[PDB]
Design a protein around this ligand. Structure first.
Ligand code: OLC
Ligand code: OLC
Ligand code: OLC
Ligand code: OLC
Ligand code: OLC
Ligand code: OLC
Ligand code: OLC
Ligand code: OLC
Ligand code: OLC
Ligand code: C3H
Length: 487
């Protein structure tokens, strides 16, 4: 038994291993969100400003495609752990690969340093992200009730890292020391790695030391050829286009757009066509399709606060926080700290609101609809502010209000999405249903990579109104079918 080799207490009434993984996750999320907060400015800021001088639209597209690839790579990353290395090996290789990606950004390698960093962090995150989560849950015995509270604690390390890192790295953006800031994220990530190496063995024991479903001799030969062919075609295409000078980011953004559309179709089709899935289990799968659209519409608007809403704030607002006499300069990277702060303050609050309502509480479909409508209302708000002022510079309080409306929507949607990938899940497709809730974000970010190209022809203000309205109309059309969706 994997529970015999591990302490069952030691970190706030939870297995001691939760403490080890909380410190490790904190530092990976701190360094990920810190690098992320800086990356957008580092890309489009001029060369004289220690930036890369990349086209603003291209820099915006990269942010979304990068985000989409991190979430898409968790699919093979969980498979690798499940069939080859185990979750422990995969978490460790991921962590090492992630540190390499952070070092790439610290060195003076310009565009090479940027794309090589993305490569190592995409691969590392796909290996580390789903596998650290798996280890956390496997620390609790079969009938253990603490498991849900254990994840609530684990995900606090995520938002604490996401909250603190933009506050720390705002200074490096201000003095234009990007390499110094990316080095700080690198060192932060090394602290996380050092802690795992020091404490993993006695606290986590045998948990995830081997793959659950290892590959046969003929399966190693089969998968090896298929992946070999796919990887080789990908390297050939990338190299041939490079030296012929037909290699642009559109090659990546279009490929990832295709992937963001195809993967959800492939997943829903496989589940609705399976012989092992019962008609009752099949009915819950089709019931998830509207929740997938609602989820996608939410993350499309939400994930745009990292590349669209922040540049708009920097360029159109006074960047001056002003609340009841308290006036201060607001650093552009601090826009990334808004959403994790509100999650930290009001996620336990909302959890009690639903618990007091009990069974009389709103359904999965209503909660998702509330969240998406709020995401759409946050874009109608900022769109109307720009329309109202025109060329006139407005208060950053407006841009901050847009972030606050969106995160209030996330508090409705997020605990509801995570609980849906297990409830509406068939017995054989539990890991596959885990992929569809993760794909609501991977697909939204994949659409975002191409969607950002509409800002120039439509106009930034018309773009917020158009995207805001589309979100609200689709939500209102789905909302009327909410009683039938609940199965
Ligand atoms: C590396 C590529 C591994 C193959 C991809 C794969 O099998 O993915 C897991 C699947 O989604 C599980 O349902
Ligand atoms: C460890 C991460 C591995 C590769 C990164 C590749 C990232 C992009 C992968 C997108 C497509 C994908 O996930 O395909 C596998 C899936 O299982 C098909 O059904
Ligand atoms: C350290 C080892 C990096 C290894 C693999 C990353 C591969 C991606 C990096 C290579 C592509 C570079 C690139 O596209 O550079 C932009 C431009 O075309 C030219 O300046
Ligand atoms: C840094 C010092 C690491 C010492 C502990 C160690 O060797 O850890 C191996 C790790 O458990 C992976 O198998
Ligand atoms: C921040 C805390 C820094 C202090 C960390 C103290 C580490 C103690 C140590 O070296 O522990 C070895 C470990 O128990 C076996 O690998
Ligand atoms: C909870 C509601 C908090 C509402 C806080 C609204 C503060 C608005 C404010 O103080 O605005 C000053 C100034 O007019 C800006 O340009
Ligand atoms: C550390 C992370 C950052 C946390 C940031 C603190 C959150 C502030 C909360 C709400 C925004 C203010 C209320 C909404 C705006 C009020 C309207 C306003 O300012 O009006 C301007 C003008 O005076 C008339 O048009
Ligand atoms: C928990 C529930 C949260 C509910 C969330 C509701 C969101 C409401 C949406 C949009 C309001 C738009 C207001 C209009 C924007 C202000 C325009 C403005 O100030 O215009 C400047 C004026 O023209 C002088 O120059
Ligand atoms: C959150 C609370 C926002 C209050 C906004 C407000 O009162 O704004 C008045 C302003 O004059 C409108 O142009
Ligand atoms: C609309 C919000 C966009 C955005 C920039 C959040 C606002 O601070 S997205 C990134 C955000 N820091 C985040 O998701 N971190 C928290 C987390 O991972 O849960």
């Amino acid at each position: 038994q994997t529970i015999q080799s591990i302490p069952q207490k030691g970190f706030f009434g939870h297995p001691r291993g939760l403490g080890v993984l909380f410190f490790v996750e904190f530092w990976e999320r701190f360094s990920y969100y810190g690098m992320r907060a800086m990356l957008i400015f580092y890309m489009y800021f001029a060369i004289h400003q220690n930036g890369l001088g990349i086209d603003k639209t291209t820099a915006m597209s990269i942010m979304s495609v990068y985000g989409a690839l991190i979430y898409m790579s968790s699919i093979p990353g969980a498979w690798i752990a499940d069939r080859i290395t185990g979750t422990r090996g995969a978490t460790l290789l991921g962590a090492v690969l992630i540190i390499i990606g952070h070092i790439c950004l610290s060195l003076p390698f310009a565009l090479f340093g940027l794309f090589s960093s993305m490569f190592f962090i995409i691969i590392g995150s796909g290996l580390m992200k789903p596998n650290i989560s798996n280890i956390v849950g496997r620390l609790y015995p079969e009938n253990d009730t603490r498991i849900d509270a254990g994840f609530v604690i684990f995900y606090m390390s995520v938002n604490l890292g996401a909250l603190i890192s933009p506050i720390i790295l705002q200074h490096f953006v201000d003095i234009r020391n990007f390499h110094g800031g990316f080095l700080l994220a690198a060192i932060g990530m090394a602290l996380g790695l050092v802690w795992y190496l020091l404490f993993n063995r006695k606290n986590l024991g045998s948990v995830g030391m081997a793959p659950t479903n290892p590959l046969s001799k003929e399966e190693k030969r089969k998968y090896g050829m298929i992946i070999g062919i796919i990887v080789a075609i990908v390297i050939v295409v990338l190299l041939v286009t490079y030296y012929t000078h037909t290699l642009s980011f559109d090659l990546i953004s279009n490929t990832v757009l295709v992937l963001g559309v195809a993967l959800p179709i492939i997943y829903f089709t496989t589940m609705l066509r399976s012989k092992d899935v019962t008609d009752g289990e099949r009915s819950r799968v089709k019931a998830f399709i509207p929740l997938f659209i609602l989820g996608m519409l939410f993350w499309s608007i939400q994930e745009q606060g990292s590349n669209v809403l922040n540049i708009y704030g920097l360029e159109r607002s006074d960047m001056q926080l002003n609340l009841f006499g308290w006036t201060t300069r607001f650093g552009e990277a601090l826009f990334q700290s808004i959403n994790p702060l509100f999650i930290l303050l009001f996620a336990p609050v909302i959890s009690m609101i639903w618990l007091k309502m009990g069974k009389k509480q709103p359904s999965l479909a209503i909660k998702f609809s509330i969240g998406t409508l709020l995401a759409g209302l946050s874009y109608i708000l900022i769109g109307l502010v720009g329309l109202g002022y025109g060329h006139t510079q407005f208060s950053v309080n407006w841009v901050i209000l847009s972030y606050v409306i969106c995160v209030i929507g996330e508090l409705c949607l997020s605990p509801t999405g995570n609980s849906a990938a297990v409830k509406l899940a068939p017995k054989a497709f539990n890991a596959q249903m885990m992929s569809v809730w993760l794909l609501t974000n991977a697909s939204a970010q994949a659409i975002n990579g191409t969607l950002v190209k509409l800002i120039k022809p439509l106009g930034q203000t018309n773009y917020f109104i158009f995207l805001g309205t589309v979100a609200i109309v689709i939500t209102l059309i789905i909302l009327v079918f909410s009683p039938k969706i609940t199965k």
